[PDB]
Amino acid sequence: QFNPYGDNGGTILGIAGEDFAVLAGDTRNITDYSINSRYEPKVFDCGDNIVMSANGFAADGDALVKRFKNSVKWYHFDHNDKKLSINSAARNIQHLLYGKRFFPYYVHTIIAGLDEDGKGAVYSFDPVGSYEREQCRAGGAAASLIMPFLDNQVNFKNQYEPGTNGKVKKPLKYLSVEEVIKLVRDSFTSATERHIQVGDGLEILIVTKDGVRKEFYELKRD
Amino acid sequence: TSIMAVTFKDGVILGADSRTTTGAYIANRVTDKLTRVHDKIWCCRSGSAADTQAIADIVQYHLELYTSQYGTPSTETAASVFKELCYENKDNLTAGIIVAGYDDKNKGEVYTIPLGGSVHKLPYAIAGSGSTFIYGYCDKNFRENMSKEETVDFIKHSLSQAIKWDGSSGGVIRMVVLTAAGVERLIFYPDEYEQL
Amino acid sequence: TTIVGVKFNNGVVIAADTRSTQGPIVADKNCAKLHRISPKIWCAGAGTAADTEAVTQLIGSNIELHSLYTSREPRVVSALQMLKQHLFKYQGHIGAYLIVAGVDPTGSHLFSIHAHGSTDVGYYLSLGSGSLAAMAVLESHWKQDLTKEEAIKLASDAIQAGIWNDLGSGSNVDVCVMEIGKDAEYLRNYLTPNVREEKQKSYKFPRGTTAVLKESIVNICD
Amino acid sequence: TTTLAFRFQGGIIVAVDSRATAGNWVASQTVKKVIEINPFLLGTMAGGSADCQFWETWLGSQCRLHELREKERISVAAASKILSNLVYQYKGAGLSMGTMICGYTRKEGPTIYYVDSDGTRLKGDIFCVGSGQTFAYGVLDSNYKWDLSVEDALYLGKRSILAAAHRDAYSGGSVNLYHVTEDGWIYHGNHDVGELFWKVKEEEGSFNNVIG
Amino acid sequence: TQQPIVTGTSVISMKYDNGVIIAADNLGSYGSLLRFNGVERLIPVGDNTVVGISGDISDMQHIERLLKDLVTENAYDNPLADAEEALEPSYIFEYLATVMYQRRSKMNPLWNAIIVAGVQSNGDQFLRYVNLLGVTYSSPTLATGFGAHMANPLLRKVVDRESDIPKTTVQVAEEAIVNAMRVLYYRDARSSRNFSLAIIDKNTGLTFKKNLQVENMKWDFAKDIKGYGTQKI
Amino acid sequence: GYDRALSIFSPDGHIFQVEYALEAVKRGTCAVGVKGKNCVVLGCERRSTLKLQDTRITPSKVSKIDSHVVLSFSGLNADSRILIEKARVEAQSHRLTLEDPVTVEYLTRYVAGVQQRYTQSGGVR
Amino acid sequence: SDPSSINGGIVVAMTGKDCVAIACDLRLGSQSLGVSNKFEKIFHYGHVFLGITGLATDVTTLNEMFRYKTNLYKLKEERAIEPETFTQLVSSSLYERRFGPYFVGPVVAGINSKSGKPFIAGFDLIGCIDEAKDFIVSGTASDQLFGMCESLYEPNLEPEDLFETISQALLNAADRDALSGWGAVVYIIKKDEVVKRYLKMRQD
Amino acid sequence: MDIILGIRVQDSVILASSKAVTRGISVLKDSDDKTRQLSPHTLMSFAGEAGDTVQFAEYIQANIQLYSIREDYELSPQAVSSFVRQELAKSIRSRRPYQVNVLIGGYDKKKNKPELYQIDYLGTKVELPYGAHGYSGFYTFSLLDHHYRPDMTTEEGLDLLKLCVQELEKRMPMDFKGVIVKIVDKDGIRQVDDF
Amino acid sequence: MDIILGIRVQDSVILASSKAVTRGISVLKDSDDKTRQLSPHTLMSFAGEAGDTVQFAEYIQANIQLYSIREDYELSPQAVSSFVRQELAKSIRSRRPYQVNVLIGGYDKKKNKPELYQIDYLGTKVELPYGAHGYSGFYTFSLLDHHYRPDMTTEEGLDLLKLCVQELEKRMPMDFKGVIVKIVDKDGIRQVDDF
Numbered sequence A: 001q002f003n004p005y006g007d008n009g010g011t012i013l014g015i016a017g018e019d020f021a022v023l024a025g026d027t028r029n030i031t032d033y034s035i036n037s038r039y040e041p042k043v044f045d046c047g048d049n050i051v052m053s054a055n056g057f058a059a060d061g062d063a064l065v066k067r068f069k070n071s072v073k074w075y076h077f078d079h080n081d082k083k084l085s086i087n088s089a090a091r092n093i094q095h096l097l098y099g100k101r102f103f104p105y106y107v108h109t110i111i112a113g114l115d116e117d118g119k120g121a122v123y124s125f126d127p128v129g130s131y132e133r134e135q136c137r138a139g140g141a142a143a144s145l146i147m148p149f150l151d152n153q154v155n156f157k158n159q160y161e162p163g164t165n166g167k168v169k170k171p172l173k174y175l176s177v178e179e180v181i182k183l184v185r186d187s188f189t190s191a192t193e194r195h196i197q198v199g200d201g202l203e204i205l206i207v208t209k210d211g212v213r214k215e216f217y218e219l220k221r222d
Numbered sequence B: 001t002s003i004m005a006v007t008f009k010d011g012v013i014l015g016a017d018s019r020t021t022t023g024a025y026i027a028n029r030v031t032d033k034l035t036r037v038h039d040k041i042w043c044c045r046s047g048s049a050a051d052t053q054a055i056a057d058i059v060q061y062h063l064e065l066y067t068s069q070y071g072t073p074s075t076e077t078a079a080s081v082f083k084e085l086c087y088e089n090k091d092n093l094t095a096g097i098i099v100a101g102y103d104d105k106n107k108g109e110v111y112t113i114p115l116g117g118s119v120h121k122l123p124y125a126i127a128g129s130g131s132t133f134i135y136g137y138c139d140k141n142f143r144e145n146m147s148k149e150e151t152v153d154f155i156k157h158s159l160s161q162a163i164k165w166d167g168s169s170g171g172v173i174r175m176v177v178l179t180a181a182g183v184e185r186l187i188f189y190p191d192e193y194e195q196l
Numbered sequence C: 001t002t003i004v005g006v007k008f009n010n011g012v013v014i015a016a017d018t019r020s021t022q023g024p025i026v027a028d029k030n031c032a033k034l035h036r037i038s039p040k041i042w043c044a045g046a047g048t049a050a051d052t053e054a055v056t057q058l059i060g061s062n063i064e065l066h067s068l069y070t071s072r073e074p075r076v077v078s079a080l081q082m083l084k085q086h087l088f089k090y091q092g093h094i095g096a097y098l099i100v101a102g103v104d105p106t107g108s109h110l111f112s113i114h115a116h117g118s119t120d121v122g123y124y125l126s127l128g129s130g131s132l133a134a135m136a137v138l139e140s141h142w143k144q145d146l147t148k149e150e151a152i153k154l155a156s157d158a159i160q161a162g163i164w165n166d167l168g169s170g171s172n173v174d175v176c177v178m179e180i181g182k183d184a185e186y187l188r189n190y191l192t193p194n195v196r197e198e199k200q201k202s203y204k205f206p207r208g209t210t211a212v213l214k215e216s217i218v219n220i221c222d
Numbered sequence D: 001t002t003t004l005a006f007r008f009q010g011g012i013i014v015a016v017d018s019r020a021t022a023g024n025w026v027a028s029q030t031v032k033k034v035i036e037i038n039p040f041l042l043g044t045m046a047g048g049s050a051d052c053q054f055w056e057t058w059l060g061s062q063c064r065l066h067e068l069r070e071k072e073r074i075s076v077a078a079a080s081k082i083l084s085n086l087v088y089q090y091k092g093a094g095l096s097m098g099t100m101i102c103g104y105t106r107k108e109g110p111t112i113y114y115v116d117s118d119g120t121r122l123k124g125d126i127f128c129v130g131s132g133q134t135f136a137y138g139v140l141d142s143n144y145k146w147d148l149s150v151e152d153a154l155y156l157g158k159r160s161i162l163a164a165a166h167r168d169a170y171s172g173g174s175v176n177l178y179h180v181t182e183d184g185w186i187y188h189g190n191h192d193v194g195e196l197f198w199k200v201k202e203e204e205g206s207f208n209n210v211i212g
Numbered sequence E: 001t002q003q004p005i006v007t008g009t010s011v012i013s014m015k016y017d018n019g020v021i022i023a024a025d026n027l028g029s030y031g032s033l034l035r036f037n038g039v040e041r042l043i044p045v046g047d048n049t050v051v052g053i054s055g056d057i058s059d060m061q062h063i064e065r066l067l068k069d070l071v072t073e074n075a076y077d078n079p080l081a082d083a084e085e086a087l088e089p090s091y092i093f094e095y096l097a098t099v100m101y102q103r104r105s106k107m108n109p110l111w112n113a114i115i116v117a118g119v120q121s122n123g124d125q126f127l128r129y130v131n132l133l134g135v136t137y138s139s140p141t142l143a144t145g146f147g148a149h150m151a152n153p154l155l156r157k158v159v160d161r162e163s164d165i166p167k168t169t170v171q172v173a174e175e176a177i178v179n180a181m182r183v184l185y186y187r188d189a190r191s192s193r194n195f196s197l198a199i200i201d202k203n204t205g206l207t208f209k210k211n212l213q214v215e216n217m218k219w220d221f222a223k224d225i226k227g228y229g230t231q232k233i
Numbered sequence F: 001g002y003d004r005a006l007s008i009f010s011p012d013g014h015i016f017q018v019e020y021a022l023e024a025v026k027r028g029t030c031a032v033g034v035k036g037k038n039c040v041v042l043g044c045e046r047r048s049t050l051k052l053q054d055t056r057i058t059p060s061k062v063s064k065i066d067s068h069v070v071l072s073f074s075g076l077n078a079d080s081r082i083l084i085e086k087a088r089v090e091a092q093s094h095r096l097t098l099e100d101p102v103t104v105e106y107l108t109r110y111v112a113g114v115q116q117r118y119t120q121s122g123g124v125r
Numbered sequence G: 001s002d003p004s005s006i007n008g009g010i011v012v013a014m015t016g017k018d019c020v021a022i023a024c025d026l027r028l029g030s031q032s033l034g035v036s037n038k039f040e041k042i043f044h045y046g047h048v049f050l051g052i053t054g055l056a057t058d059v060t061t062l063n064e065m066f067r068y069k070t071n072l073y074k075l076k077e078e079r080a081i082e083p084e085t086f087t088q089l090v091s092s093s094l095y096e097r098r099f100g101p102y103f104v105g106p107v108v109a110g111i112n113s114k115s116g117k118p119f120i121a122g123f124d125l126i127g128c129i130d131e132a133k134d135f136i137v138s139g140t141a142s143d144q145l146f147g148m149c150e151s152l153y154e155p156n157l158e159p160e161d162l163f164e165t166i167s168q169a170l171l172n173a174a175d176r177d178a179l180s181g182w183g184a185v186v187y188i189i190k191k192d193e194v195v196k197r198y199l200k201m202r203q204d
Numbered sequence H, I: 001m002d003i004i005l006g007i008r009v010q011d012s013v014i015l016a017s018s019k020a021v022t023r024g025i026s027v028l029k030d031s032d033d034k035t036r037q038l039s040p041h042t043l044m045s046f047a048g049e050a051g052d053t054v055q056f057a058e059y060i061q062a063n064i065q066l067y068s069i070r071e072d073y074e075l076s077p078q079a080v081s082s083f084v085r086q087e088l089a090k091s092i093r094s095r096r097p098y099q100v101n102v103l104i105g106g107y108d109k110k111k112n113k114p115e116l117y118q119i120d121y122l123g124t125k126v127e128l129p130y131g132a133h134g135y136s137g138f139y140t141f142s143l144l145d146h147h148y149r150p151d152m153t154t155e156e157g158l159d160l161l162k163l164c165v166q167e168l169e170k171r172m173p174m175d176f177k178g179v180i181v182k183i184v185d186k187d188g189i190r191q192v193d194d195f
């Protein structure tokens, strides 16, 4: 019997700072035990300072990104070139996903950008459209490896102030773009070591008020 | 597999392709499907590689023990031992075997043993997935009391066609000649047989 | 796994990668897939990891007892016969896929065994998930009358093909050379082309970070 | 999930946890399971996160359209019935929702309606919904009286979620409290179970099963 | 919901400094039966694109008709049909990708794996894959079926990343492709000896080679192999 | 389906079909409504050119839409039945979804909306 | 009805400079229902420590079985069993039940008393040995533990520093797993002293 | 849902319906009224699939109330039962059938007689002196066969009904949290508050 | 079978076990004692598959009584629990396993301490301050987490137990016909007749 779904592997990661936000993703694309491409990007600039990635089944992922990119275009046409805010994009994406509630897009979606106060924003979606704003989210094949590391290093979970008898928690603070990129690179090298579907290359998209910058780093190719 | 054994004036010749597969992958392109159970009693193997190897090893053991006590066994006797194993373990075996041997009294003889474990003595036999495509050809072209060179050509042309149509058959064409003179191994490569 | 075996002038060489998987997770990054049956008979194993280890040790044990009983150096065909009859008896349930090689008084030998108990003979062989990548290289570069150094190069290149192209294989290349008239040389980590890069950050915590409820000295003595 | 809401002398208490799971994978510890429909209406979420989130926001749009058309805030009964009639149309399609529509109006007073995805709609004083509902019931029922003070009622709701968060593997994160009066709903904070459990253990002397 | 009947096996391809090469054998298999031997699975579109197709042959012939019709439709009311407004490889691919994904979404797929190879108007090499699921990806080397498992490893030794493309000539590239086709004939049970090869160069244009044969094969070592273990004769 | 736009604007900005429908109302028997401090009374004329009538069974001029709302009319008798039926159905539908009977304003707004729809729908008068 | 994830639990082990650490959570449940918060998964036979995750009945059974076997070993050998030897004993015993296996994920940890070398090892349910220089993980949050250990770990950590690393690896991994947590225990093991610490963690 | 009973006596029809609403391992409510008044002298109790029951009951209620307003007249219990049967008979061959079983108790004012109709989800109608749906019947029918007489009073019928509830409370596996009892007679419908 | 509870307090262990035996749609018995005295200071309650429960309980009882006669000595609750666990651990990999869950309440006379052990049919043993088997735990554990203190008296434990039974009688779907309560302390085993 024909199976309309497949698994293209890969993993993605979004972190938000004070005045910026990053959305990273590995460039490897796979089916079963074969590599299809060592460089196939899945993190996209969608306009209006919104970056997006839909990881899982690549055909559904490309379809969704394509439809959202198109949604941004028509939002301009219908509302006098108004900038689509990250919160409005998130709600729009929920309806795209839930529209296929009974034949879902098989993807974990993450978007990143700046909110209307200029502060960094990351939103994450399940396959059928539930969403939530967070400081931190990993998605895809190695999400279960990376996410607990992020809880510990970004949100300082389970870390207490030394000498305070485990009474005072380590205080929350925003991380610099330099510190965040260090965490992203370490997260992906660790994931590459222990997960077979992760590797080849890392592509990070950074979002500030000035625009969308890119950075690329090599990953292990085994 | 495509395998066959053909009796002729001076004795009998066994023939086989050299392809072993796992689905559509060729696990071995130079396989030897013609195997010795006794000096001048050989068999062609088709079906499961594991089953046919295990069976052939047991038969070789039985005939070696037979020879130690009662001297050289007949080809019929060898076929009976194959049958006994194939029949009694029919539920757990996937083995299509052709038994061929040379006596001096009985000359060349061919016995075929299909899946069920039945025995059939024939002038010539064909078996394996690729045999289906050459029933027509072999029936029209086989003659009794052929010469060595005619029988070699008959087998070569037959397996050439079987190989051409069957995806599960290919590689080289191995042959084993059983006569009073002795045992002769023959090999034929694609460049020769493909353009027949 | 990717494993290979290649015959040369005066003997035989086998090789293997060093990745052990647990679904999509890399359990062991540097495991040993080359096994010693007797001093000059070695085995490369793919498939169920416990089965390859257990079946190789059992036959290796019985081969040692046989060698002592007969006052003779063991033969590769004996190990081949004992392995195949054991595996056949278990109707494929013992998932051991082996490349058996070695030198003995009869000469040098190279065989493969499959889980259901079938054996093959060849000058070059490959087994495991990366066997197609390895066999592609072997079919491209193999020739008759290889030297020792040429066979090692060909074998390791065939493993590398698996390392880079098969997700089931990775990390390092182990080699074992069995030459006639000489001791077998086991080359553990013959190639190490997958070294982990320096991490961006030290994750050494300040002492006291973890909250503690109880301390107590444990008694290990009598 | 664990969610509850109960009616009492001083209005309605609504309490929920904040965990989201995908099998045994803890996906989030900070999910908002109470939906603010208007200043006088609340909705709780249990079951499929997308189903609940999508259709309860949709419910809020339908309630807004009612007050535009009728120049009057929608009743709790009518609001709950819009949702129950909606999910009934999808009956058999596989929606997964256990919700509670809580609010105050003049004609009704404080009112709670249980609504689920197989079309059940029930008016009542006490309900617990979710995988940890039984754990919440155990504490809530054994301590519930109609004459509870606002202060005690808030605590009992908080304590009942804590009980379920502790025992139910698929409940946890933090407790979100709400109090619904004649003047509308009032938010009573996010309470992390990480700190709340130990604070409650020490001060109350309960949870003696745990290593102190 | 379908099942494939008459099928075609691997399609392999790679980029080189000035263009792209693509190849596929001429077989139409009917299960294990090697039924049809005169089947062309490389279909040129214009003078700048070649579409290689594996999988179901009835669906391949349908796709042929679509591409044929696409050329006709593009020519309508188009004075620059053989110039600036000619069909690009990227246009042809995106059309097929759209169709493939729409058909999978209706639970009635075209049971194929497709590689579109060509050269764009600005000289850039184009090479992209699409299949029955609507999955798309691009790489310096691309292959379908058994080709993915056996050809890619060999072709990646020549062009391992982007920077290796300018360093790879058409002579070196074709040699690797022809070698890969030989390996597939050794090891793929649903392959044939006869195949077609196509080169699309930014300077010399489209070169379509028919009736090629696998040659320089190693079979001689087979004579030395006897039995399956202990046998000596 | 019959599609003709029967209700349309004229050069002076009048919809004659709607205005001629008012003439039909002017022809109908008189109906009056007076509301007191704690009640409403509906009075209706019945023409006396019809003797030998059976008043037991003859349709009454005032109709109950629900147990708490009533509707009287002036104009075409056959037309009124269609409006009354629709109103009665909407009354029960409101009780079913809102769990509360209609307000008099709501019921009126519905009946008025039905009448309006028939002024810019094709194929209807 | 998946035996390895009915009760839940995790175990992790690490090496340091002249020391080893092994840690485990305390939860025992029945699917969603948490039953016990005192269920320790680490045992020791002399100076050799064994952690076991998986089906709780088999955890108990195997502990009792290896206590049995190590006691007889000591009586006959007249010395304590070493980690390398004990590792082989565990592997043999699990593979004995090849076609009716114990549903467990054991982890060995200890220091060889003769050489002084730190030693850790892991196994699958049928006895395959997984040796490591750095760390071994096991249980329902093994994916999480792999991610934590691979990033947080560095070689040659002092006993006091190693404690912080392994504890943070376990705690944060446990908090992303529904069936793991409810308390934790860490064993720091030096050549001739062993410290056991109970960790404060979230109880949901 | 679960237990619904009905007894027709000399001058009235008595319906008893369980108060429990259970989902999973939790009794969500213990005061549920499993009935709807279709008209002043007609009452319908119901049991079956969650959601379907109330949706069906209220749909029938709306239709009967619509009829009453249109004709300024009350349909006979027999007429109402036939309408209900037909709706269920349609339903059973729909894409998704109503899984609802009902009892209809009414007092026919033209005949001056009480009437009890039992209708299952297939649309199987029967007029009976006493009726039950689900597993209840397996205890109550034999009990009523013994103790029931056709000329009983309303008080005698309530005592007969107490005897049924006692038997069910003794031998039924599930706790159904008692019953709400309602009487239908010449004066309409009223609820017994102390049972 | 269904509901079995256990509470360990300062000086005693209290076991409560439901009285109902149900088969199909009939409660066959409402006075069933789901327990066996293994020794003078050790009591075992049980629940699970019909037949298996009593067969297993009596088999354990016979073995412990045999031990007592042989050694003229009473096994400790810990020792008895370990024996029971091993028997169930054997059973789970048998051709037909015992589908029985048990609680073992005992008073250790050497330690002068009450002890409660919970063992499921797989052979999963835990010592607990309070325990339950089946769906009961889903209500009682959270309740006891709140109200339980380690230094409670036997009377305080019975009131705590009444609170559990009341909650179960309110929220459980099935009628389990109340409980038989037994106390295990320094003076042995006795039954509370009025609960």
Ligand SMILES: *[C@@](C)(CO)[C@](*)(O)[C@H](CC(C)C)NC(=O)[C@H](Cc1ccccc1)NC(=O)[C@H](CC(C)C)NC(=O)[C@H](CCc1ccccc1)NC(=O)CN1CCOCC1
Pocket: B001, B002, B019, B020, B021, B022, B023, B027, B031, B033, B045, B046, B047, B048, B049, B050, B051, B052, B094, B128, B129, B130, B168, B169, C114, C116, C118
């Ligand atoms: C022609 C090909 C067919 O008649 C010949 O008969 C040859 C005979 C020679 C080799 C003696 N037959 C085969 O090559 C034979 C085909 C076959 C396959 C399955 C059942 C019966 C016959 N191939 C084999 O026996 C291979 C040999 C290995 C690759 C060395 N074995 C398998 O393919 C095993 C067989 C398992 C089995 C099944 C039923 C009965 C007995 C044994 N199968 C697998 O390994 C399954 N494989 C796993 C990966 O996914 C693809 C399938």
Ligand SMILES: *[C@@](C)(CO)[C@](*)(O)[C@H](CC(C)C)NC(=O)[C@H](Cc1ccccc1)NC(=O)[C@H](CC(C)C)NC(=O)[C@H](CCc1ccccc1)NC(=O)CN1CCOCC1
Pocket: C001, C002, C019, C020, C021, C022, C023, C027, C028, C031, C033, C045, C046, C047, C048, C049, C050, C052, C095, C128, C129, C168, C169, G004, G104, G105, G123, G124, G125, G126, G128, G129, G130
């Ligand atoms: C390449 C990497 C893949 O083919 C090689 O072939 C290597 C062979 C080397 C290591 C000898 N193969 C593996 O690494 C092999 C892949 C595999 C997995 C499952 C079945 C067959 C092959 N991995 C293993 O064998 C691991 C060894 C671990 C990492 C030490 N074992 C497992 O993954 C076991 C499988 C056990 C098994 C039981 C019954 C039949 C077959 C296999 N699975 C688990 O541990 C999963 N699970 C964890 C939670 O607890 C319950 C078990």
Ligand SMILES: *[C@@](C)(CO)[C@](*)(O)[C@H](CC(C)C)NC(=O)[C@H](Cc1ccccc1)NC(=O)[C@H](CC(C)C)NC(=O)[C@H](CCc1ccccc1)NC(=O)CN1CCOCC1
Pocket: A101, A104, A126, A127, A128, A130, D001, D002, D019, D020, D021, D022, D023, D025, D027, D028, D031, D033, D045, D046, D047, D048, D049, D050, D052, D096, D130, D131, D170, D171
């Ligand atoms: C308690 C906490 C648990 O029951 C509550 O009931 C909460 C309610 C809150 C969150 C509103 N329920 C859940 O957390 C709920 C449980 C559940 C899961 C699946 C079906 C029904 C109920 N969890 C979800 O809805 C999660 C929320 C995500 C993780 C943020 N979503 C999923 O599991 C999704 C979508 C499931 C789905 C439903 C209908 C059609 C298609 C899919 N599934 C995945 O993301 C799949 N999977 C996750 C792991 O990574 C690989 C992909």
Ligand SMILES: [Cl-]
Pocket: B020, B031, B032, B033, B049, B053, C119, E228
């Ligand atoms: Cl063979």
Ligand SMILES: [Mg+2]
Pocket: A191, A192, A193, A194, A195, A196, A197, A198, A199, A220, A222
């Ligand atoms: Mg990797």
Ligand SMILES: [Mg+2]
Pocket: B163, B164, B165, B166, B167, B168, B169, B170
């Ligand atoms: Mg062929």
Ligand SMILES: [Mg+2]
Pocket: D164, D165, D166, D167, D168, D169, D170, D171, D172, G203, G204
């Ligand atoms: Mg919890």
Ligand SMILES: [Mg+2]
Pocket: G174, G175, G176, G177, G178, G179, G180, G181, G182, G204
């Ligand atoms: Mg946890």
